A paper describes a structure:
The major psychoactive cannabinoid component of medicinal cannabis from the plant Cannabis sativa is Δ9-trans-tetrahydrocannabinol (THC), which can bind to CB1 and CB2 in a low nanomolar regime. We obtained clear residual electron density close to the active site of [name]. Modeling of THC here resulted in a very good fit to this remaining electron density. [name] binds to THC at the entrance of the hydrophobic pocket with the aliphatic chain pointing into this pocket. The binding of the THC molecule is driven by hydrophobic interactions of the residues I167, F210, L213, L216, W254, F274, Y306, and V365, as analyzed by the PLIP server. THC works as a partial inhibitor on the catalysis of both isoforms. The apparent EC50 value of THC with [name]-β and LPC 18:1 as a substrate is 1,026 ± 138 nM, as shown in Fig 2A. A similar magnitude of inhibition is observed with [name]-γ, with an apparent EC50 of 407 ± 67 nM for THC toward this isoform. It revealed that THC functions as a mixed-type inhibitor, which is demonstrated by the decrease in Vmax from 8.5 to 7.3, 6.3, and 5.0, respectively, and an increase in Km from 10.1 to 19.6, 29.9, and 31.5 µM, respectively. However, the authors are aware that a comparable water molecule also exists in the [name]-THC structure, where the distance between the THC oxygen and carbonyl oxygen of F273 is 4.5 Å, thus above the PLIP server threshold for such an interaction.
Numbering used by the authors: 56 to 65, 73 to 395, 403 to 569, 589 to 858
Write the structure that this text describes.
């Protein structure tokens, strides 16, 4: 009936007993003491223990394990941890009975990466962690850039569509229930998928501290509890801890991210970090523990003034439910009728509607029943609401909020912070930006844990660590290619078309892609390009070619515009045919290697082979022809040549994964020719642009995209203007990681380079965001 001698144990006395309350009567005395505040005065040094004080400055406190964190500094002349110089920590300096260096996760809500430039005058402790440890210039959250999806992504390594927490608010039709940030419903385990770090640790024998705190527990008491847990005996001491602060999120919403008011919470956060680090040094654990300082998302300038209203677009908005704000999700209280009515209606429309299946694949935001079919992507700095009355402002007439977040995760104001400090991290080291889905694997490596299956790429962050790295193994190739010669006569071919090799390894710079599923396919060589041609899908899985800086673009001759040629290397039974296209009134065809870039009049005939052809809507051909005729030459001219790999993607169930043949739902009329949902291109060059793409020594440079194969250009409100005004903007919107294309294709890229595999894993997880 009492919490005596079991405050914050690992009637309830735990961190959450207050949350939907359940604490023993005496919890607020024994466990939430507060007298004297949280720091030692030189006036109470050597005091006589008063059991009402929050923390203690008696000399028995080091033996009783309850000093204030500044006790050695004020009462024994030691320095603050922040006043010591960086000293490289080569090994963990831990007590003898420690089996692994502990991990402390210090998570900050809404910490914009830019905040790191307010400097040591605002955040000396944080700036010391950043400069002496390992830090990225920023870390990319997942979409939507909201608190709960992103904190749970950090804990699991999973996209929201997979771990289930797809928003701060969501409706689950199978439960017929709603989930919100406030309320008891979030406490029900039915909402939460994947396997969070605290569960991974416990299942593998690694004790976790309680990661969560009832809101009425002050930040100073949370830090004190973590330090007192670290002083437990060997068989009780947890190995992993978490501290969370709702700041600077609250102030960023109220005053906006550029408000002078922002330095107040930024200082209070930095003092809490100082309290942690002084406490660790007091325990002489400051060279033993790995510390992670990480944010969930950034913060953007948003105001009531900048709101789009559905009631300006729909005739009746009272018959729909809208999840509003920095994103939109719509359900009923006709779907493409609603989409049509929201599509390009106002000149500078500050949101775009999507069926979720048509969102950029890099968002990975569709494969979950809690994600509504209709999605609105909202311009940064802007809000979307159902109707004007939903915008609440102070009686002062001023807006209630000046900052918000939730936008597309390539928005620079949404990027957040990563710093790692301690024995396992590198010393005074800066690493490139990375996505937060990669962090779960790192924390597992820091703890000696085997990660649960997740969406990180294990080994892509090895450069963050000085030890305990994961050694990735390149996957074995599963399908071996055929190399067909001339096996067939031009006379054997029906098809209904008409038409008036190791030099070729200037076109395959990084080895052939490995095919990681079982299938039959052929390598085909040509003067200008190489392809892996699938006998099952009747088209290339990949087409690879190199365009040098000085390449010339030619046209498609008038006498060749409608030319398709049979390929004598490939059976007529394993080729496409032109009858299907003539009979498919909506489908045209295009070519993966562009005829525009042929090296000679004779070579160009290769580009018209039936094995180079892929099904394309006319509306998509406007995009593809512009990319092939205009943009490839541009990139090659900018990057001292480029190597391009292009191919189809089939993802009819929108799970981000290569469809089997059973899942493909659309074929060219009267044929077995499957229709791709997307087309990809990977564009590689030398990071050192003074070396040409085909003669690159060191690191590589990549940009990639996954373009939706649509029968219209309704996504592009300016598509009626010249293609130079919209096509490249559409391509930047559909940028992707090479790793994204690998999931969607079953291919494995960059297998023959002079780079280490871990370096290559990093390359494949880069996303060019512009
Ligand atoms: C807002 C504050 C009161 C804190 C609210 C905390 C609440 C969101 C936390 C507290 C308990 C957590 C669950 C607990 O760890 C058990 C698991 C098992 C794991 O496999 C899936 C996640 C789950 C359900 C945790 C979800 C988050 C919880 C509810
Ligand atoms: C993200 O990672 C999860 C976990 O590995 C993947 O989800 C698994 O997908 C397989 C194959 O479809 C299923 O058999 C498992 O049941 C899934 N597990 C979970 C926890 O959902 C998911 O496919 C990955 N997403 C991407 C885009 O790669
Ligand atoms: C690795 C970065 C931190 C991960 C650990 C971590 C800590 C943490 O306190 C939370 C995490 C995850 O996610 C959920 C479960 C969404 C919590 C929601 C409610 C509150 C108050 C805090 C959140
Ligand atoms: Ca046609
Ligand atoms: Ca799929
Ligand atoms: Na439940
Ligand atoms: Zn947040
Ligand atoms: Zn917020």
């Amino acid at each position: 009936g009492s919490c005596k001698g079991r405050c914050f144990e690992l009637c309830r006395c735990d961190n959450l007993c207050k949350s939907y309350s359940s604490c023993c009567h005496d919890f607020d005395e024994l466990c939430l003491k507060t007298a004297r505040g949280w720091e030692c005065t030189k006036d109470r040094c050597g005091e006589v223990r008063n059991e009402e004080n929050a923390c203690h400055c008696s000399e028995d406190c080091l033996s009783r394990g309850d000093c204030c964190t500044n006790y050695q500094v004020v009462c024994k002349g030691e320095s603050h941890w922040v006043d010591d110089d960086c000293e490289e920590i080569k090994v963990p300096e831990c007590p003898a009975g420690f089996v692994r260096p502990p991990l402390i996760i210090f998570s900050v809500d809404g910490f914009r990466a830019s905040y790191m430039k307010k400097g040591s005058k605002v955040m000396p402790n944080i700036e010391k962690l950043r400069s002496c440890g390992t830090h990225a210039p920023y870390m990319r959250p997942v979409y939507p850039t909201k608190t709960f999806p992103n904190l749970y992504t950090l804990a699991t390594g999973l996209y929201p569509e997979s771990h289930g927490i797809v928003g701060n608010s969501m409706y689950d039709p199978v439960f017929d229930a709603s989930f919100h940030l406030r309320g008891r419903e979030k406490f029900n385990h039915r909402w939460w998928g994947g396997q969070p770090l605290w569960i991974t640790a416990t299942k593998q024998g690694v004790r976790a501290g309680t990661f969560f705190w009832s809101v009425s527990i002050p930040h100073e008491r949370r830090i004190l509890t973590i330090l007192q847990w670290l002083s437990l005996p060997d068989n009780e001491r947890p190995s992993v801890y978490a501290f969370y602060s709702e700041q600077p999120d609250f102030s960023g919403h109220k005053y906006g991210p550029f408000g002078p008011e922002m330095t107040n919470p930024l200082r209070e956060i930095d003092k809490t970090v100082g309290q942690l680090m002084d406490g660790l040094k007091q325990l002489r654990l400051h060279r033993c523990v790995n510390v992670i300082f990480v944010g969930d998302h950034g913060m953007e300038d948003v105001t009531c003034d900048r709101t789009e209203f559905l009631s300006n677009y729909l005739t009746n908005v009272d018959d729909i439910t809208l999840v509003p704000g920095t994103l939109g999700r719509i359900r009923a209280k006709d779907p493409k009728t609603i989409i049509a009515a929201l599509t390009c209606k106002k000149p500078d429309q500050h949101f775009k509607p999507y069926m979720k299946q048509h969102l950029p694949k890099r968002l990975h935001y569709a494969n979950n029943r809690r994600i509504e079919d209709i999605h609105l992507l909202v311009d940064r700095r802007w809000h979307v609401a159902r109707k004007p009355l939903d915008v609440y402002k102070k009686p002062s007439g001023k807006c209630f909020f000046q900052g918000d977040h939730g936008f597309d995760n390539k928005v620079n104001s949404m990027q957040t912070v990563f710093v790692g400090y301690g024995p396992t991290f590198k010393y005074r080291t800066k690493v490139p930006p990375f996505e937060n889905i990669e962090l779960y694997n790192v924390m597992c490596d820091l703890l000696g844990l085997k990660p649960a299956p997740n969406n990180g790429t294990h080994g892509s962050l090895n450069h963050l660590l000085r030890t305990n790295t994961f050694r990735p193994t390149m996957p074995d190739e599963v399908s071996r290619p055929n190399y067909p010669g001339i096996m067939y006569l031009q006379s054997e071919f029906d098809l209904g078309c008409t038409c008036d090799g190791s030099t070729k390894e200037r076109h395959l710079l990084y080895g052939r892609p490995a095919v990681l599923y079982r299938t039959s396919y052929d390598i085909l060589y040509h003067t200008d390009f190489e392809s892996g041609y699938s006998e099952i899908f009747l088209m290339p899985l990949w087409t690879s070619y190199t365009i040098s800086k000085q390449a010339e673009v030619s046209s498609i001759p008038e006498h060749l515009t409608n030319c398709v040629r049979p390929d004598v290397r490939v059976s007529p039974g394993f080729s496409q045919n032109c009858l299907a296209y003539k009979n498919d009134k909506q489908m045209s065809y295009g070519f993966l290697f562009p005829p525009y870039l042929s090296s000679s009049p004779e070579a160009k005939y290769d580009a018209f082979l039936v094995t180079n052809m892929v099904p394309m809507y006319p509306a998509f051909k406007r995009v593809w022809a512009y990319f092939q005729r205009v943009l490839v030459k541009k990139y090659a001219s900018e990057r001292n040549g480029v190597n391009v790999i292009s191919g189809p993607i089939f993802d009819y169930n929108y799970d981000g994964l290569r469809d089997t043949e059973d899942e493909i739902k659309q074929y060219v009329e009267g044929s077995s020719i499957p229709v791709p949902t997307h087309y990809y291109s990977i564009i590689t060059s030398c990071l050192d642009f003074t070396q040409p793409a085909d003669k690159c020594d060191g690191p590589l440079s990549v940009s990639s995209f996954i373009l939706p194969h649509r029968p219209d250009n309704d996504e592009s409100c300016a598509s009626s203007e010249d293609e130079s005004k919209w096509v490249e903007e559409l391509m930047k919107m559909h940028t992707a990681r090479v790793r994204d294309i690998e999931h969607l294709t079953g291919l494995d890229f960059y297998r023959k380079t002079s780079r280490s595999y871990s370096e290559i894993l990093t390359l494949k997880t880069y996303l060019h965001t512009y």
